[PDB]
Design a protein around this ligand. Structure first.
Ligand SMILES: Nc1ncnc2c1ncn2[C@@H]1O[C@H](COP(=O)(O)OP(=O)(O)OP(=O)(O)O)[C@@H](O)[C@H]1O
Ligand SMILES: Nc1ncnc2c1ncn2[C@@H]1O[C@H](COP(=O)(O)OP(=O)(O)OP(=O)(O)O)[C@@H](O)[C@H]1O
Ligand SMILES: [Mg+2]
Ligand SMILES: [Zn+2]
Ligand SMILES: [Zn+2]
Lengths: 615, 615
RNA sequence: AAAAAA
C-alpha cells in the first residue's frame, strides 16, 4: 500500500538507476535521481519511457558541482542532497535509498542521510560481467536488451542493509523551511542550489545535543535543570569548580543568569543616589513633599568593617518609604523603577513586599494596593518581550505585617491580614499580578515571637494563603521553631539561627520549608568573615549540604545598595568552595519554593532551563 | 605531538595506502589497513620497506569475505571492522580515517564507524591521471617513483572531510570484552574473525536510545521518571491511554511495576485462609493460644453490594491482632510473612504501622517494638538481592496512637508517643529499619477530633518526628484543616471529604501534604459507583488534576483481602479514564512523600525509574 | 574495489 519511492545517485556510469528500479518484490513510483551535471541521463529516460510509463521520475543536478577538487563542493552537494531529501513529502516507510553510483563521497553521504532521516531501506546493486563488447567480460553497457537479459537470467544481486529508524524530530521536519532554488527549470529535470549553509548546522548541533544528552544521561536527576545535560564534558567540568568572584568572566556569567527573586521590599529600593531624585521629582503635590535629607552611611558601606544593629539599619532608609510614598505619583514611579531594575537584572520572577496601610492618609489602603498592582500590571503589559507572549518579569505581591517593640501595631497586623485575604480573593487571573501571601516582619525578641500571633493568622490559614515569617535574625532556634510549627510558615526569612538544632534542621529540610538568605543584609547586620579571614561561618554551604531549600535574595536594594547578582557574588565570597552548580541549585530551590501555580512553575522551569548562557 | 594513527581500507586497487600515508603536514605512525583475502598488498609492503622504516604498518584481512553475494558477509565485515577499530588502544585525537578503497558499502561503513567512534580527521584521496599505462590516459596503479612524481608536482588532492566527536560511551571501550580471533598469522598480515554480531546490536540500540531521548526530551519534566523518556512514541502513546483492568497484559504490567507502600497495618495481614494457620502454628505456648474462629465475610466481600460500617469492619479482623500476636513467635512469624508478601508484591519501600502497647502483658511494649524491628531487620539481611548490596524491600515503622469512643485510651496514646520518640532516638543507622513517624488513629467524631491532642503532640514536634493523621473518612473538611494546621501533619489518611472545600484543597496542594487513598477499604466502608455503573465520585482523578499529592495503598491487607496490584486496578475501575501515567504519578508522589532521607530518596527514584517494565 | 556498481 506504501508508495515506496526510490532515492538514487548517478555518476559517469548510467543504467544503474534502471537496475536499481526493478528490485524484486517491490513496485515503485516517482524515482528520483541525483547527478553532478557532468554525465548524461538519457538512458534512464528511454528505459522508463519504453518499459515503465507511470514512474514520472525526476533528475536533480547540483549547482556547478563540476568535479571533486576541494571540500566546499562536497559540502554544498551534501546540503543540496539533504534539502532534496526534505523537498519530497515522504514518510519514513516510503524512502528506498541506494548508495550506488558516482563518488564514494556521494554514497557515504547517502548512507548517512538515510541513517539520520530514517529511510525505509538501503541497498547496493551489483551486476556481473556478462557482455562481449569490444573486449570480453565487460560490465553491462547502456543498451536495454542486455540489461533485461542480465535480470531475467539472474545476474543481479541487490544487497539491502536492512531498514532504518532515524531521528524522531528529523523524520518529517518541514519542506518549507529549508528551500531549494532552481537555477534552470525544464521538463522532468532540474538543477538546484541552496542559498545558505543552514541544514549542516542544524544536523550538526542536533547530533551534538543527542551526543551530549547520551553522555550525561546518567546523574541527570542530580542536575537542577534538564538543559544542563546538553553542555559537554568541558562545560560540565567548568560548572564544577568553586566560583571565582574576581574574574570578570564569572561576573558576566552570573549577570546574564536568569534569576528568581522572593525577598524584596518595595519600601527600600529608591533611597540613595539618583533613583531617589527620580522618585522625588514625580510627586503630584511637591509642595508638601518632605525636605531632601540624605542619611549618612558608615565608612565602606557595602563591605562595612563593623556590623550595625537593626535600628540604624531601618533608619538608613528614612529618605524613602512612609515619608515619601504617600503621594500616588511617587509610589507609581517607585513601582516602575523597581520593575525596570528587576528586568535589567534579568529576573524572570520576583515577589515584592509592600505595606499599603502605611501609605493611607486620605486614600484607603485598598486604594493603595490597587494602585500598586495596577502599576505593576500596566508595566507588565508594556514589556511584552520573551517567547510565548509572556511578560519579561513576573512579579507578585506579599503583604507585610510588621511588629514593633512598643506602641500600636496589632491593629495594623489585622488590617494587613484582612487586606491580603480580600486582595487574594479579588484578583484570580493566572497571567496577571496577584497577592500570593503574607509576611510577619519587624522587631523580634522573646516577647514578639511567632506563637503570639496565632489567633489572627487563623483567618489567613482558613482562607488558604501562603505565609512567610522573619525568624532567626535576632533570635535563637526557638523562634524558628515557633514560626515553623505554631504559625505554619511556608518560608523563613534569614534563618541564620537554624544550625544549632539538628532536629529543627532535619524537620525544615524534610517538610521542604524554604529559607531565604540575603548575604548583604546578613553581613551588614550580623557581620561575617570574608574569604575565610564570633558570628560564625555563613550557613549557606551547610544548608545546601543538609538538603534544606535555601535561596539568595536582595532584601532592601536601596538600603544595601546592590542587586541580586552582587548578592550571589558575595554569597560565593562568604563561603569558599561554593560552586556555580550550587548557584543553579539555589535557583531551582527558589523556583520550587515560590508561591505560584503548577503551570506557571513549569513555564518558569522551562524558561530558566532554556535561558542559561554558556561559558 | 599526537601519534596520528591511520585507518585505511584497501580494495583490488593498491597504491591508495601509499597515497593516503602522504599527508601535507601530519606525521604518521602505525598505518593499519583492512582488506579482503584475495587482493594484493605486496606493493605497500615494499613502499614502506624503502620509504618509511619506522612506521610498522599492519594488514588485516577478513576471513570469509571475498565477493559479496548477500548482506551476511557485509555484516561480518562490519562487525570485524568495528572490533579492529577497538583493538587498537587509540583515542579520537590521533585517529585519521581514510575511506579510499573498495566497495561503496565499505566506504560508507568506514565513514559510519568514524563518525560513531569519533576520529580526529576523516578524509580520502583522489588521483589525477598521470601515468600513461598500456592504453590511453591511465592513473597510477603502481610505480612508486611515478607516485612520488605525481606527489611533488601535485596531481593528488586529499579531500579533507573533517573531524568527528563521537559518542562518549564508546570513545575508548576495551578489546578484551569484544575481542578478535586470528585464523592465521605470518609477518604483519593477519586474517581475522569475529564470533558474534554483538557490537552491531549494541551500537544500534544505543543510537535507538538516543533517538528515544531526543524524541521525548521536550516533555521530560512532565514524565514522572527520567527513564520513562526512553520508551519511543509507541510505548508513550500506549502509556497515555486509559488503563483497562480487564486486559491480562495490563494486569501483568501493573503487577511487575515496582511499588511504594505507605499505608499498611501490621495487625491486619493474617486474618483468613492458610496465612492465619501459618501464623497460628508458631506460638511459643500453643496451649494458652485461644480457639480458632473466623468471622464470616459478607456476600461478595472484595466487591460488596452494600456499604458497611467501621465497627463490624474492625470486628472482621478479630482472628488476628491482640488476640493472637501477644505471643513473640506469632509476632515474628507475622512480620516474616508481611515482608515476604511485600517482596512478592514488588514493593521496594513500605512503612508498616504497629501498636506494640497492645501486645504487652508480661513484656514491655519496648520489647514488642524491639522484637518487631529485629524481625524486620533479619528479614532485610536475609534477602540481600538487587544491585548495590541493598535489600529488596525497605520497611520503616510508624507507631499508631489509637482513639476510642469511650474508655481509657489517653494513657495508651501518651505511651505510644513516648515510645515513638525513644525508638526514633535509639536507632539512627541509614540502611536499616527505623521508627520514622507516628499516627493518630482510632475512632473520631466532633469531640474526638485532632485539635484536642496538641498538648500531647508538641513533644513529637520538638524531637523532630514525622506525623500522620486519619481524617476525612467520617467527617467534613474541618478535621482535615485541624490536622493540617493544628497538628502539622505531613500526610493525611482517607481524606475523601477534602473536595468539598476548595481553599483547603489549594492549601494542601501548595504545601505538598501527601494524601493516602485505599480504594478497597474506601469502597467497602463508604461504597462507590463502579465503572460509572449517593457517596459521590471517587476523588482520585480530581485530586490528580488539582495537583495534590495522592497515593494508593492497601490499608488492611487481610481484612480487605487484596494487594497493591488489586488496589491499583480498582483505582482504575473507580475512575474511568485513569491512565497509566497517573499510576506512575502516584508512584512518584508516594516516593516523594515517604519519610526517608534524601540519599535514600534518590536511590529509590533511580531504581524505580530503572525498574519499570515495558509493554 | 580513488575520477564515478565487482
Ligand atoms: N531586613 C529586614 N529585617 C527586618 N525587618 C525588615 C527588614 N527590611 C524591612 N523590614 C521591615 O519591613 C517593614 C515594612 O517595610 P516596607 O518595605 O514596607 O518599607 P517602609 O514603609 O518604608 O518602612 P517603615 O515602616 O520602616 O518606614 C518595616 O517595618 C521594616 O522595619
Ligand atoms: N481503616 C482504619 N481506619 C481507622 N483506624 C484503623 C483502621 N484500621 C485499623 N485501625 C486502627 O489501627 C490501630 C492499630 O491497628 P493494628 O491492626 O495495627 O492492631 P490490632 O491489634 O489489629 O488492633 P485492635 O486491637 O484495635 O483490633 C487499631 O486501633 C485500629 O483501630
Ligand atoms: Mg521603612
Ligand atoms: Zn524581608
Ligand atoms: Zn489505615
Amino acid at each position: 500500500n506504501v508508495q515506496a519511492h526510490l532515492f538514487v545517485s548517478l555518476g559517469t556510469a548510467p543504467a544503474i538507476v534502471p537496475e536499481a528500479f526493478l528490485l524484486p518484490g517491490a513496485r515503485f513510483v516517482s524515482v528520483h535521481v541525483l547527478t553532478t551535471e557532468r554525465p548524461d541521463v538519457t538512458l534512464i529516460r528511454e528505459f522508463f519511457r519504453r518499459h515503465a510509463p507511470g514512474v514520472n521520475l525526476t533528475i536533480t543536478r547540483v549547482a556547478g558541482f563540476q568535479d571533486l577538487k576541494s571540500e566546499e563542493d562536497h559540502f554544498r552537494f551534501e546540503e543540496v542532497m539533504f534539502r532534496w531529501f526534505l523537498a519530497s513529502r515522504t514518510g519514513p516507510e516510503q524512502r528506498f535509498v541506494c548508495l550506488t553510483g558516482g563518488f564514494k563521497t556521494m554514497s557515504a553521504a547517502m548512507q548517512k542521510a538515510a541513517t539520520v532521516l530514517g529511510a525505509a531501506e538501503v541497498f547496493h546493486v551489483l551486476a556481473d560481467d556478462c557482455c562481449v563488447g569490444p573486449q570480453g567480460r565487460l560490465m553491462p553497457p547502456s543498451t536495454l536488451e542486455e540489461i533485461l537479459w542480465a535480470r531475467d537470467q539472474g545476474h543481479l544481486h541487490w544487497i539491502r542493509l536492512g531498514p532504518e529508524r532515524g531521528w524522531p524530530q528529523l523524520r518529517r521536519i518541514a519542506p518549507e523551511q529549508f528551500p531549494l532554488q532552481v537555477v534552470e527549470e525544464k521538463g522532468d529535470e532540474r538543477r538546484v542550489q541552496a542559498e545558505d549553509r543552514a541544514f549542516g548546522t542544524f544536523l550538526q548541533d542536533l547530533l551534538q545535543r543527542a551526543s551530549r544528552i547520551a553522555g550525561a544521561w546518567e546523574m541527570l536527576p542530580e542536575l537542577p535543570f534538564a538543559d544542563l545535560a546538553t553542555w559537554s564534558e568541558g562545560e560540565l567540568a567548568w560548572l564544577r569548580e568553586p566560583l571565582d568572584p574576581r574574574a570578570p568572566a564569572d561576573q558576566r556569567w552570573v549577570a546574564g543568569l536568569p534569576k528568581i527573586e522572593l525577598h524584596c521590599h518595595l519600601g527600600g529600593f529608591a533611597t540613595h543616589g539618583e533613583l531617589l531624585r527620580r522618585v522625588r521629582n514625580a510627586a503630584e503635590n511637591p509642595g508638601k513633599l518632605p525636605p531632601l535629607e540624605e542619611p549618612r552611611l558608615p565608612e565602606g558601606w557595602p563591605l562595612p568593617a563593623q556590623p550595625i544593629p537593626l535600628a540604624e539599619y531601618m533608619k538608613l532608609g528614612n529618605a524613602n518609604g512612609t515619608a515619601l510614598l504617600r503621594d500616588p505619583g511617587c509610589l507609581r514611579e517607585q513601582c516602575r523603577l523597581l520593575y525596570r531594575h528587576l528586568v535589567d537584572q534579568g529576573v524572570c520572577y520576583a515577589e515584592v513586599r509592600c505595606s499599603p496601610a502605611n501609605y493611607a492618609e486620605v486614600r484607603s489602603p485598598w486604594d493603595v494596593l490597587a494602585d500598586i498592582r495596577a502599576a505593576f500590571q500596566e508595566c507588565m503589559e508594556g514589556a511584552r518581550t520573551a517567547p510565548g507572549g509572556l511578560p519579561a518579569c513576573h512579579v507578585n505581591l506579599i503583604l507585610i505585617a510588621t511588629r514593633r517593640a512598643s506602641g500600636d501595631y496589632r491593629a495594623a497586623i489585622a488590617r494587613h491580614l484582612a487586606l491580603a485575604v480580600t486582595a487574594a480573593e479579588h484578583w484570580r487571573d493566572e497571567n496577571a499580578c496577584r497577592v500570593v501571601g503574607v509576611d510577619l516582619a519587624g522587631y523580634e525578641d522573646e516577647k514578639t515571637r511567632a506563637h503570639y500571633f496565632r489567633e489572627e493568622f487563623t483567618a489567613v490559614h482558613r482562607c488558604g494563603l501562603a505565609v512567610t515569617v522573619h525568624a532567626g535574625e535576632n533570635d535563637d532556634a526557638e523562634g524558628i521553631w515557633r514560626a515553623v510549627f505554631d504559625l505554619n510558615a511556608r518560608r523563613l526569612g534569614h534563618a541564620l539561627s537554624l544550625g544549632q538544632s539538628r532536629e529543627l534542621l532535619r524537620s525544615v529540610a524534610d517538610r521542604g520549608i524554604g529559607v531565604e538568605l540575603c548575604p548583604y543584609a546578613n553581613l551588614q547586620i550580623k557581620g561575617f568573615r570574608l574569604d575565610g579571614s564570633a558570628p560564625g561561618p555563613y550557613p549557606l554551604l551547610d544548608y545546601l549540604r543538609e538538603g534544606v531549600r535555601v535561596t539568595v535574595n536582595t532584601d532592601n536594594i536601596g538600603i544595601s545598595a546592590a542587586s541580586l547578582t552582587d548578592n550571589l557574588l558575595l554569597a560565593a565570597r562568604l563561603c569558599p568552595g561554593l560552586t556555580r552548580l550550587d548557584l543553579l541549585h539555589l535557583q531551582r530551590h527558589a523556583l520550587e519554593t515560590a508561591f505560584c501555580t503548577a503551570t506557571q512553575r513549569l513555564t518558569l522551569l522551562r524558561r530558566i532551563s532554556s535561558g542559561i548562557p554558556r561559558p
